[PDB]
Design a protein around this nucleic acid. Structure first.
Ligand SMILES: [Mg+2]
Ligand SMILES: [Mg+2]
Ligand SMILES: [Zn+2]
Ligand SMILES: [Zn+2]
Ligand SMILES: [Zn+2]
Lengths: 87, 97, 559, 112, 178, 171, 280
DNA sequence: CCTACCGATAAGCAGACGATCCTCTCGAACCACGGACTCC
DNA sequence: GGAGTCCGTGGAAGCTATCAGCAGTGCTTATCGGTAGG
RNA sequence: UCGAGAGGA
């Protein structure tokens, strides 16, 4: 009730990025680049925003934080840099 | 083309919650309506120029919330309203669970 | 969006509370009076009377009006009115819910038959459920048909102490169509010798008992203090749906073509207006009930015409009327037909064909289909030169655009437009552009039985009107090319496109999690020829071996 | 033991024609029917009469019958389901919709 | 639309509550004991025209310091002209209401120097009265105990007639010059 | 009369403004709408307090669009009046009906009947006046008014005040 | 009916198979918590075979002239002989292998060794011999301590559920069990050298390649699981030829099978059809 | 050894549900009173 | 100087001639042997 | 548009 929120310490979630998180982080970032959002990584002549959203994940210059909700309501804010990309 | 139950069930299976939501709103119904936050009903008289948003039965022009929902849902809640059923669309969480 | 900006906030509907309409709130919510049952002409002149249709609600013939708010056909969502029912009437859906409450809570006082003092009543009320607690309360109060005053003898030593009010005998209730009657016993060597007494239980009597039911008798029977008060199961004031719910349609110019519910609501007004004058003028006692049971029937068949085992209600010509219940009933009826599944835009369908030279994930979209379907691309520095060249090619030279959206909501149909040849194209503008190659799109084969059948397909725009596909991808869909047709859905966002390319891809769905084995393989000529080739018997000479190696797209260049 | 027998009979029908469907799928629906107290019918009255919010259940056969009981008992649909978000036209908490994403100023300045 | 701070719950329609009067029956939003953005249950923050005048002056003096940091990479009538200049730099001409309030707040301020306002708040926010009553005492000039009890009718029983006169005599000595 | 309220505001931000100079831009959009506004729930919003250290938290990047919905937690000064509250302001408007008093950003009107019976209007005087003996209400004349009633009206609160009582009148 | 009953069901962020309402169906999806695509039918060599060949192929004995490892396999084959402290670990290794055989026989009573499990170790060992070109003539770089402990340290790195308490720690050990049984079966100290011929360089890569494949094999929270199951069971029913017949030559005559039997299983359903019980 | 009561198993009898998507074409609605206007 | 066919306006039909369910046991209501306490 | 009928993988 009083904000719940599990801190950045003591977290029971997978340190790896879930395929749904990857697709949401890419889909939204590609949408934002398409909506003229400023690009953080050095562009290599990329005409497609998903080609960029994918390249932004390589250097990890995405400033997004994932609120992963548990079944009891409580959530863990995982920064895209913390989440490892094995998949 | 029809994006029925068979079509929806596959997009659920995949996990693509936005593509299914896109086919179910942007590519189909999609309607913006004003609802009274005090009650949860569509009783708001939305004037988008004079700004007299007043809900007849509540007096409020402040606790009113516009919402993007399918035109079929709007119609369904109005059909339920015609049979004395009140589906109070509540934007505020009150049980946590 | 429903077109136009609003100065009100937009928020996710986190929960939905269900209840009943209070006839007190309907009379305050209402915008219309509905005196005239007529649905057309000012007063037999032109454009709908202030009785039924647009008195102070939903607009009609190209007019904005809508009770001074205007907005227009596509924006005005219609406004609910109110109909004052001459005599209160039951709701078809809550027929046994009223009946069982009558059988549980005793009449003559408005109090429960049983109380906390009974041991089984404590065993029944112990669950804080809703319907499962009421399930035992219905069977418990069903019998012991009589109210009480003094009962405790084995909890208090011997003498009995007061708890309830007037101990009148509760009658037995059953069904005789829309009405329910009670059977009082008595007959102990006095009146009616041995046969019981029967009384007609009218809505006005039932409602007064339901009005005298306590707030703690609601919680005990599964009802709410402000949402589902049992008094609202009987209708005193009826909410009238607006034109978007029951439209006029407009048959040419000087004709009606009204909705089924408009004629059905007029029939309720016709039944109510007779009661309106019969109650006011000389009352013939057993002649008002002969019309009150018809108003009860009209208000009932307007909600349910399916309905009970005995009545029907037909609209002459001989066919029946379409009730609200039948309107939102399952299988292609509001819920399944319009909410749980619906017809969509940006969708194609043609006779499918196989192709040895198509890529596994690829799809052969006909040249016309790509020209008929459009993706909305936002004007960024990465395209512009590309978008301006598409715009210039227009709606007929394949890589073109149909509409261009300005900074504000203004579509520029290039097919028409005086400025189609010009157009500067500013940043942030949208370009509804013809489908291009390697565009992630949804390819679907009905019935969509498993995770597959709906996959992402690399687009290759090809001549000949046919939906071409790879041969090895014939297995996830299960279809062959004996005249089969297939669906398609071009995604309109950069996010839903990535939700396809990085989730529903044909190679991404190569292995079935159903059986843990793959769900695509080498079949037909590709498999029949592989057996004939992979042998010690057959060898390939220099002339054919060089073409064999050249056909491989990822060939190292080393013989 | 009832669910272990239930699975034995559910598996044997798939085993009768075409091998096979992975344990996880049948052990799931078997566990669905038995993690109720006892047995659950997969019909209009078995699984459909459940602890769920009215809008998820109204989509399966008992539609107007359930919509009336929703109002009559003052039920509150939690709006935590696959079906109730489909009706509401909102991104349901399914796969991609089962987590929210925000932007961070601490990170936004950091990258420039 | 804002509609925040003290919210929940709206259990269908509601009766309104009560009229907003000077019987300390303040708004349904302005409770004696309210909440904070940090979380704590902080007492209602009500200020008099002298206290509130030096709070907007504080918020706008510290606004220009921050607004121009990002740009890198006393006396009665002089107070009127210096505030008029400050309002044009920190805020655009469009804000008509703030300019009308600041001209009023300075022309009717009982205490102009921050030194005196500290002792005024220590004299009033101590007595044991509602912060709105304090916000009206330091704002409105009163010589008689019966004058302060009639203009601020929330007192009467709340405070002694003799002890209130001791406070009123202290404010005439704490009073500033214009 | 003046209150310090620690209230918040929900703002939706376009994806193109996701650049290092965003924190300052969101802070501006807040005082662009809030500072100068007049709510019924909170009264006249006068000044957003402490531009430094403003709690913004995080902006939920929305479902099908890339916009971030930020909730800006702030603290500001509010001018909320009440039906009974006594105030002293400047007389601005004056005519046969009565006079308007500018108490801060709010104008309070006093009718000829709401003011004393032993006063009366003087038409033959420029600017318009209200005489009695040596007490005259003109273009300036600071007065003390008791707010008898309050008017919500648009984003501009008004009042229907009285000056006919003991310890009231002109100041 | 299947898809409607299993709509709400999905894997959660705490490895639990719950739904919309929030009730627990399974505490770990399909009891192991592995994404059904990342699995192959692997054979458990500890369950299969006679007790003599199991003692022959796995038992390591440094305190014997014929039951020891030849120094052509291990670099330090002669200085490891007769070691009491190193045979303590080779007793510990074979004592966990003797437990695997008796525990596996309790689970798979029918005998069947070929079971669908993640991480194809069968191919990882095949790939090490090609990626490192290891020869059979020359001995390995590793020793007994490098194998027996590295195999044990790998079991700690095979996480499924993230936990710190008595329940989740035991839920983790219960989640692996069958897989780490295959791991002890495949990475036994004798087998590593007797059949594979593995060097310390290639073995340390094999231990990391097993955990990398295993951590990839964990279910994705958001996988619609119930929806997927409902489709995966409703799909073969569409192509289910044969109704009430089969077997040939067991129990001559009818026995309801296929779609008619399936209706009974879903309806539940106190009707005879074929109620033939079995007595032993 | 009876009767105030309490659970046992039959004889009636009651209401909403059954592949997904797709495409094409045919023919609508009639007995009596009260009295309106245009059209012949 | 009276008709011609017109179409709004009211109009529910009536006495026939014959009926658990692709499932199964659906749920509510009458008859009925026996317990043991006064 | 409604209702009935017809046809297809
Ligand atoms: Mg086929
Ligand atoms: Mg619920
Ligand atoms: Zn309202
Ligand atoms: Zn409208
Ligand atoms: Zn009674």
């Amino acid at each position: 009730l009083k904000e719940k929120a599990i801190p950045k310490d003591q977290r029971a979630t997978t340190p790896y990025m879930t395929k749904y998180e990857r697709a949401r982080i890419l889909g939204t970032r590609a949408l934002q680049i398409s909506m003229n959002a400023p690009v953080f990584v050095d562009l290599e002549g990329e005409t497609d925003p998903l080609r960029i959203a994918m390249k932004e994940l390589a250097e990890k210059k995405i400033p997004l934080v994932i609120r992963r909700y548990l079944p009891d309501g409580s959530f863990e804010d995982w920064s895209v840099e913390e989440l490892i990309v094995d998949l | 083309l029809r994006f029925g139950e068979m079509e929806r069930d596959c997009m659920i299976a995949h996990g693509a919650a936005s593509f299914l939501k896109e086919r179910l709103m942007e590519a189909s119904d999609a309607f913006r309506v004003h609802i009274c936050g005090i009650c949860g009903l569509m009783t708001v008289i939305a004037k988008l120029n004079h700004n007299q948003f007043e809900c007849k039965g509540c007096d409020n022009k402040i606790d009113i919330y516009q919402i993007h929902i399918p035109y079929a849902a709007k119609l369904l809640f109005q059909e339920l309203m015609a049979m004395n059923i009140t589906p109070r669309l509540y934007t505020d969480r009150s049980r946590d669970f | 969006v429903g077109q136009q900006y609003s100065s009100a906030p937009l928020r996710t509907v986190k929960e939905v509370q269900f209840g009943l309409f209070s006839p007190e709130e309907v009379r305050a919510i209402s915008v219309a009076k509905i005196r005239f049952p007529e649905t057309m002409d000012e007063t037999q002149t032109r454009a709908k009377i202030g009785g039924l249709n647009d008195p102070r609600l939903g607009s009609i013939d190209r007019n904005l009006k809508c009770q001074t708010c205007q907005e227009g056909m596509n924006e005005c969502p219609g406004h609910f009115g109110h109909i004052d029912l001459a005599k209160p009437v039951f709701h078809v859906g809550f027929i046994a819910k009223i009946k069982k409450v009558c059988e549980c809570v005793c009449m003559h006082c408005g109090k429960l038959l049983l109380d906390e003092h009974n041991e089984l009543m404590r065993q029944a009320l112990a669950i804080k459920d809703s319907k499962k607690r009421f399930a035992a309360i219905w069977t418990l109060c069903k019998t012991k048909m009589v109210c009480e005053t003094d009962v405790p003898s084995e909890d208090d030593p011997t003498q009995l102490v007061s708890r309830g009010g007037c101990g009148n005998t509760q009658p037995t209730i059953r069904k005789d169509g829309l009405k329910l009657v009670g059977s009082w016993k008595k007959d102990r060597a006095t009146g009616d010798a041995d046969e019981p007494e029967l009384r007609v239980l009218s809505t006005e009597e039932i409602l007064n008992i339901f009005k005298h039911i306590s707030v703690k008798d609601f919680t005990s029977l599964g009802f709410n203090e402000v949402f589902s008060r049992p008094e609202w199961m009987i209708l005193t004031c009826l909410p009238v749906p607006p034109p978007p719910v029951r439209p006029s349609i407009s048959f040419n110019e000087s004709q009606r073509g009204e909705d089924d519910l408009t004629f059905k609501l007029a029939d309720i007004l016709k039944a109510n207006i007779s009661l309106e004058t019969l109650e006011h003028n000389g009352a013939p006692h057993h002649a008002i009930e002969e019309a009150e049971s018809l108003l009860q029937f009209h208000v009932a068949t307007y909600m349910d015409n399916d309905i009970a085992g005995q009545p029907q209600a037909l609209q002459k010509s001989g066919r029946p009327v379409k009730s609200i219940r039948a309107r939102l009933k399952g299988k292609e009826g509001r819920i399944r037909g319009n909410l749980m599944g619906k017809r969509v835009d940006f969708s194609a369908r043609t006779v499918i064909s196989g192709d040895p030279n198509l890529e596994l994930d690829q799809v052969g979209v006909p040249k016309s289909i790509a020209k008929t379907l459009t993706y909305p691309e936002v004007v960024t520095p990465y395209n512009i030169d590309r978008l301006t060249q598409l715009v210039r090619n227009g709606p007929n030279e394949h890589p073109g655009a149909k509409y261009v959206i300005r900074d504000s909501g203004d579509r520029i149909d290039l097919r028409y437009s005086k400025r189609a040849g010009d157009i500067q194209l500013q940043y942030g503008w949208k370009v509804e552009r013809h489908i291009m190659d390697n565009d992630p799109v949804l390819f679907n084969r009905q019935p969509s039985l498993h995770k597959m059948s709906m996959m992402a397909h690399r687009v290759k725009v090809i001549p000949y009107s046919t939906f071409r596909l790879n041969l090895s991808v014939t297995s996830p869909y299960n279809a062959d090319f004996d005249g089969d047709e297939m669906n398609l859905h071009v995604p309109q966002s950069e996010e839903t496109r990535a939700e396809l390319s990085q989730l529903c891809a044909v190679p991404l769905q190569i292995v079935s999690p159903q059986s843990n084995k793959p769900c695509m393989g080498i079949v037909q000529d590709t498999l029949c020829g592989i057996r004939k080739l992979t042998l010690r018997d057959t060898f390939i000479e220099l002339d054919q071996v060089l073409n064999m190696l050249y056909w491989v797209p990822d060939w190292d260049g080393v013989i | 033991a009832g669910r272990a027998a239930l699975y034995k009979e559910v598996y044997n029908v798939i085993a009768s024609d075409g091998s096979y469907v992975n344990y996880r799928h049948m052990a799931l629906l078997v566990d669905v029917m038995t993690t109720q107290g006892g047995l659950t019918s997969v019909t209009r009255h078995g699984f459909n009469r459940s602890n769920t919010g009215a809008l998820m259940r109204c989509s399966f056969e008992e539609t107007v019958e359930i919509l009336f009981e929703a109002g009559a008992s003052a039920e509150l649909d939690d709006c935590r389901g696959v079906s109730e978000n489909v009706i509401l036209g909102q991104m349901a908490p399914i796969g991609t919709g089962a987590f929210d994403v925000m932007i961070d100023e601490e990170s936004l300045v950091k990258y420039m | 639309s804002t509609s925040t701070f003290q919210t929940r719950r709206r259990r269908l329609k509601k009766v309104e509550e009560e009229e907003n009067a000077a019987t300390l029956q303040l708004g349904q939003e302005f409770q004696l004991k309210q909440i904070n953005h940090q979380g704590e249950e902080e007492e209602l923050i009500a200020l008099n025209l002298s206290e509130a005048r030096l709070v907007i002056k504080e918020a706008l003096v510290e606004r220009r310091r921050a607004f121009k940091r990002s740009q890198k990479k006393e006396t009665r009538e002089k107070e009127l002209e210096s505030i008029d200049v400050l309002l044009e730099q920190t805020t655009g001409g469009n804000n008509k209401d703030l300019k009308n309030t600041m001209q009023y707040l300075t022309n009717f301020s009982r205490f102009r120097d921050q030194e005196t306002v500290g002792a005024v708040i220590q004299l009033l926010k101590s007595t044991g009265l509602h912060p709105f009553e304090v916000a009206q005492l330091g704002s409105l000039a009163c010589d008689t105990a019966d004058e302060a009890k009639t203009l601020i009718p929330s007192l009467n029983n709340k405070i002694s007639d003799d002890e209130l006169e001791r406070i009123l005599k202290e404010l005439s000595n704490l009073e500033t010059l214009y | 009369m003046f209150f310090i309220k620690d209230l918040s505001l929900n703002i939706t931000l376009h994806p193109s403004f996701f650049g290092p100079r965003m924190k300052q831009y969101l802070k501006t959009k807040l005082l662009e709408e809030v500072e100068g506004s007049c709510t019924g729930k909170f009264g006249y919003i006068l000044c957003v307090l402490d531009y430094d250290n403003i709690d913004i938290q995080r902006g939920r990047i929305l479902p099908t669009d890339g916009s971030a919905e930020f909730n800006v937690k702030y603290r500001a000064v509010v001018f909320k009046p009440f039906k009974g509250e006594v105030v002293d302001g400047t007389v601005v408007s004056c005519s046969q009906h009565g006079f308007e008093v500018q108490v801060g950003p709010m104008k309070v009107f006093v009718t000829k009947h709401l003011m004393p019976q032993d006063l009366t209007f003087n038409a033959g005087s420029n600017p318009p006046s209200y005489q009695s003996s040596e007490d005259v209400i003109t273009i300036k004349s600071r007065i003390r008014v008791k707010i008898e009633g309050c008017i919500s009206q648009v984003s501009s609160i008004h009042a229907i005040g009285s000056i006919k009582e003991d310890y009231l009148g002109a100041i | 009916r299947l898809v409607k009953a299993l709509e709400d069901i999905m894997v959660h962020y705490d490895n639990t198979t719950r739904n919309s309402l929030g009730n627990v169906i399974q505490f770990i999806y399909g009891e192991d918590g592995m994404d059904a695509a990342h699995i192959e039918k692997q054979s458990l060599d500890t369950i299969g075979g006679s007790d003599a060949a199991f003692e022959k192929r796995y038992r390591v004995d440094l305190l014997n002239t014929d039951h020891t490892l030849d120094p052509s396999l291990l670099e330090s084959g002669s200085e490891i002989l007769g070691d009491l402290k190193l045979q303590v670990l080779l007793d510990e290794e074979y004592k966990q292998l003797v437990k695997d055989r008796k525990f596996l026989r309790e689970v798979f009573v029918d005998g069947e060794a070929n079971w669908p499990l993640p991480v194809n170790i069968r191919r990882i060992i095949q790939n090490a011999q090609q990626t490192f070109h290891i020869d059979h003539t020359k001995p390995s770089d590793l020793t007994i301590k490098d194998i027996v402990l590295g195999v044990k340290d790998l079991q700690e790195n095979l996480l499924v559920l993230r936990g710190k308490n008595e329940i989740i720690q035991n839920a983790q050990r219960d989640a692996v069990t069958l897989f780490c049984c295959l791991l002890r079966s495949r990475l036994a100290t004798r087998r590593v050298l007797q059949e594979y011929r593995l060097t310390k360089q290639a073995f340390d890569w094999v231990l990391s390649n097993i955990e990398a494949q295993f951590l990839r094999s964990v279910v994705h929270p958001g996988e619609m699981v119930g929806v997927l199951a409902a489709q995966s069971i409703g799909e073969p029913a569409t192509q289910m030829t044969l109704n009430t017949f089969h077997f040939a030559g067991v129990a001559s005559k009818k026995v309801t099978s296929g779609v008619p039997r399936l209706k009974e299983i879903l309806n539940v359903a106190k009707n005879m059809k074929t109620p033939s019980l079995t007595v032993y």
